[PDB]
């Protein structure tokens, strides 16, 4: 139904100044239905009180008591499954299932979910109270990314997800990098619970913000520890969280609200796709106080210096007068004023920047030039040690003379990507590694 | 030391 309010109608105004002159007479009309193009599901942007059916919480209490009593995993799973079928039936009658949907899972992991994984032996040692224990602990288990409409017992309320995320930050960050798959899957589940409830309030913003910082921290840990892990999967998931988080900011802004940490995560969006001009126009439309924040100014400062006119990649169009300030890029990375998390994101481009630094320099040398000594390159491109640069030269078939100089005129590749060869292993900067060792993970993620 | 275009 179309909204029919005197204040709104007066505010919009009439189509014509004086309908009476044209012979029109004031008329009363029926409240017509809302047209199909005007219906929009507004995501919740305000704190909502948590209320649950008294029968629903009593059912969970029975599940908790039943779980303690029963010791056989197969028997416990069957009893819980039968109760779930009855639980879904009454909820359909109650109408709190498929329409506003609110979760009721008070504990970190649903009791039915814990029972299901117990019989499938998919419970990680982190969730178990003791390594020899066979039943997943209620106070340490976490819900798995799910992929029949979900019941209110399966999804957990937003004010629990904040508590759940706090548990991950405090008691599970030190387990990296061995628990990369565990945390990445579990955190992805937390965002899934929010989108089930169609919630985008302060809790969702706060939780989504910290998830991004974990991914940046995880990104540096994996490359530092030289442990094989999925890179594209990690980056795509990080990019999805940024565009989702940026989308929430527009809705809050459009509703007259504000987000205290919008500026910080606008910067990460710029660094997600360094060489994409689309993000340069998006940041310009933003208000002045966001465009002039130090995190945002630092972010697009990098975008300019990374911009190289010789950047060759399939499906990429070069642009005019690109700076290609590789020397300035490494001066910013060493700046004590650089936020650490931004540094972790920018480490993914070190191989690309270094290659185009040498490729650009190679074109400005005559054929009779002596090989460039490694000592000069290390101070220029910030290589951690001589072992790193010699591996870099071997990867791109750069001739190395006497083990201490590089013959840049022998470089043949014009693109940082080799069709046959696997991409070079990602590296890091020892300056950023030193900064990390002076700050706890918990303090870094909270900010 | 002389210039040589590439």
């Amino acid at each position: 139904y179309m909204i029919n309010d005197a204040k709104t109608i007066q505010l919009v105004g009439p189509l014509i100044s004086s309908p009476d002159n044209l012979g029109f007479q004031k008329r009363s009309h029926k409240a017509r239905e809302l047209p199909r193009f005007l219906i929009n599901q507004e995501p919740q942007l305000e704190k909502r009180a948590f209320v649950q059916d008294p029968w629903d919480k009593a059912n969970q209490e029975k599940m908790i008591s039943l779980e303690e009593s029963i010791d056989d995993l197969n028997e416990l799973y069957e009893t819980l499954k039968k109760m779930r079928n009855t639980e879904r039936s009454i909820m359909e009658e109650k109408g709190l299932v498929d329409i506003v949907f609110q979760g009721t899972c008070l504990d970190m992991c649903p009791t039915f979910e814990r029972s299901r994984r117990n019989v499938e032996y998919t419970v990680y040692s982190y969730e178990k109270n003791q390594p020899n224990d066979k039943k997943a602990s209620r106070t340490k288990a976490l819900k798995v990314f799910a992929r029949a409409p979900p019941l209110p017992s399966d999804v957990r309320p937003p004010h629990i997800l904040v508590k759940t995320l706090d548990y991950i930050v405090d008691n599970l960050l030190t387990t990296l990098p061995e628990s990369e798959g565990f945390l990445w899957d579990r955190m992805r589940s937390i965002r899934q619970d929010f989108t089930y409830q169609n919630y985008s309030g302060p809790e969702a913003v706060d939780c989504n913000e910290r998830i991004v910082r974990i991914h940046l921290l995880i990104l540096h840990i994996m490359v530092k520890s030289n442990v094989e892990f999925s890179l594209q999967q990690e980056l795509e998931q990080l990019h999805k969280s940024l565009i989702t988080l940026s989308e929430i900011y527009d809705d809050v802004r459009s509703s007259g609200g504000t987000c205290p940490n919008e500026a910080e995560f606008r910067a990460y969006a710029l660094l997600s796709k360094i060489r994409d001009p689309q993000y340069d126009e998006n940041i310009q439309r933003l208000p002045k106080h966001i465009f002039q924040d130090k995190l945002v100014q630092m972010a697009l400062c990098f975008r300019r210096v990374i911009s190289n006119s010789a950047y060759t990649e399939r499906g990429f169009v070069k642009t005019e007068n690109c700076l290609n300030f590789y020397a300035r890029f490494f001066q910013l990375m060493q700046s004590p004023s650089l936020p650490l998390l931004m540094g972790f994101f920018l480490q993914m481009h070190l191989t690309d920047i270094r290659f185009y630094a040498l490729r650009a320099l190679s074109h400005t040398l005559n054929k009779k030039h002596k090989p460039i000594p490694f000592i000069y390159l290390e101070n220029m491109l910030l290589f951690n040690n001589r072992q790193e640069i010699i591996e870099f030269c071997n990867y791109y078939s750069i001739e190395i003379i006497n083990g201490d100089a590089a013959d840049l005129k022998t470089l043949q590749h014009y693109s940082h990507k080799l069709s046959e060869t696997q991409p070079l292993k990602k590296t890091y900067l020892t300056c950023l590694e030193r900064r990390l060792q002076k700050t706890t993970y918990k303090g870094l993620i909270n900010g | 030391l002389e210039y040589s275009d590439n």
Binding site: M2, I3, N4, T8, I9, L11, V12, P14, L15, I16, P19, L22, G23, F24, R27, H29, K30, R32, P35, F37, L38, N40, E42, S254, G256, P277, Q278, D280, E281, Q284, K294, Q297, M298, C301, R304, S307, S309, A310, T319, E320, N321, C322, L323, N324, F325, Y326, A327, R328, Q331, L332, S335, S337, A360, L361, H363, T364, I372, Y376 | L1, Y3
Partner: protein, 445 residues
């Protein structure tokens, strides 16, 4: 009276078929009074049983929707009557999708006339998006979807539908830019030429060509393809000068394209004479760009940086700050190096440029930077250029072709050809940039 209007629409006359009550109020008011006591089923059956009505269902529903609009229109409330207007408009366009739709030739002027009205109405409604519990730019987005479906319906076989093809494209792109979603214009541009049945692009009306090039170049500039953007901007303004300037609306459109033509031309190292541009631009605007020209002509990086900072807001609105910050410094460096080379090589006969000489001339050009104690907090303006990166500046210039020299990292100097003529050392900017980045021809087809 109602039957009289149906006869008017059945025979193809569309004098009263309009949504603008200013020129249609008397007719509809009488129509509403006679039709106030009927149901939706009554109106639909009324049209179906009317003689000589075309058998097409698209035309049937359009007539019923207009009658439904007339019956329940509320002149005192644009919002309360909004659903009827948009419902009729979508039916009107749907009647225009089929190439062989009845009375399509006379229906084309109606669609253009109603489109301009509803675009104006949608802009008014989307302004009050907060009070209407609707997302921002929702009414315009809905209309763009309606027009987009119409645009896809146009195919080459002068049919009336083909006549408004370029008119339709300009409307679609203007909506996309207005709803702040300009990347959607890519689909329109890629399919505009195949759908057009004209032998050459210049066969369209000149006013529409200027609008199309203005949007196309504006679209290119967003993707940071300045040379492609410049060609359309330059060509559009050349065509605009032919039109008479007595309209006083050409001039306001003349200064709109100049706001993008001047910064784009400067990026490619082209200065504009202020003679022909005198009527289009105010004296204040002439001085504002003249300051930038002086800074970039004589290699003043700090001056360019300060000018962008001073003009940050209005450049940021036109999606110009980032592009200008990207490209202007490298042109500024070329002029700076051209100045020192002229006074060092061509006059004093020294073809070796020590890095120490360039370093002390860069720190004069750039001045205070992030590392200096003056600028404690990094900004976009004092965080990109530093005098310490002497070799980096030279390396980029040589790779871009703006400078013909060889640099020696170990000797801390760059050697250059020992020639009196500077053109052998520092070639003209525009020729090098255009050579390295060929642009699409200004003649589309």
């Amino acid at each position: 009276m109602a039957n009289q209007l149906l006869d008017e629409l059945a025979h193809g006359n569309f004098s009263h078929l309009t949504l603008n009550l200013s020129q249609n109020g008397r007719e509809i008011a009488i129509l509403q009074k006679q039709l106030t006591g009927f149901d939706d089923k009554q109106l639909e059956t009324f049209v179906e049983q009317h003689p000589a009505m075309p058998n097409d269902t698209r035309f049937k529903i359009m007539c019923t929707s207009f009658l439904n609009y007339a019956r329940d229109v509320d002149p005192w409330s644009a919002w309360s009557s909004s659903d009827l207007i948009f419902e009729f408009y979508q039916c009107l366009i749907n009647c225009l999708i089929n190439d062989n739709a009845p009375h399509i030739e006379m229906l084309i002027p109606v669609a253009t006339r109603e489109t301009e009205f509803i675009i104006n109405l949608a802009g008014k409604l989307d302004s009050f998006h907060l009070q209407l519990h609707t997302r921002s730019h929702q009414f315009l987005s809905h209309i763009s979807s309606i027009l987009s479906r119409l645009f896809n319906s146009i195919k080459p076989p002068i049919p009336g539908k083909q006549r408004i093809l370029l008119y339709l494209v300009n409307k679609l792109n203007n909506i996309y830019f207005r709803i702040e979603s300009p990347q959607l214009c890519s689909n329109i541009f890629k399919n505009f030429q195949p759908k057009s049945m004209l032998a050459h692009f210049n066969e369209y009306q000149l006013d529409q060509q200027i609008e199309y090039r203005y949007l196309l170049g504006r679209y290119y500039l967003l993707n940071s393809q300045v040379h492609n953007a410049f060609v359309q901007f330059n060509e559009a303004f050349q065509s605009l000068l032919n039109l008479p300037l007595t309209n006083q609306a050409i001039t306001r459109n003349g200064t709109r394209i100049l706001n993008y033509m001047i910064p784009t031309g400067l990026i490619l190292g082209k200065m504009v004479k202020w003679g022909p541009l005198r009527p289009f631009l105010s004296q204040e605007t002439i001085d504002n760009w003249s300051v930038l020209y002086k800074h970039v002509r004589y290699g003043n990086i700090q001056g360019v940086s300060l000018w962008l900072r001073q003009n940050e807001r209005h450049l940021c609105a036109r999606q110009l700050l980032i592009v200008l910050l990207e490209k202007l410094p490298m042109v500024t460096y070329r002029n700076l190096i051209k100045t020192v080379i002229k006074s060092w090589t061509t006059e004093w006969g020294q073809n070796k440029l020590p890095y120490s000489l360039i370093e002390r001339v860069l720190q004069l050009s750039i001045g205070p930077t992030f590392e200096d104690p003056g600028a404690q907090e990094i900004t976009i303006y004092n965080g990109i250029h530093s005098p310490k990166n002497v070799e980096n500046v030279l390396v980029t210039l040589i790779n871009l072709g703006l400078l013909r020299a060889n640099c020696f990292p170990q000797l801390q100097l760059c050697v250059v050809k020992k020639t009196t003529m500077i053109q052998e050392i520092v070639p003209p900017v525009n020729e090098r940039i255009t050579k390295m980045f060929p642009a699409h021809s200004h003649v589309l087809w």
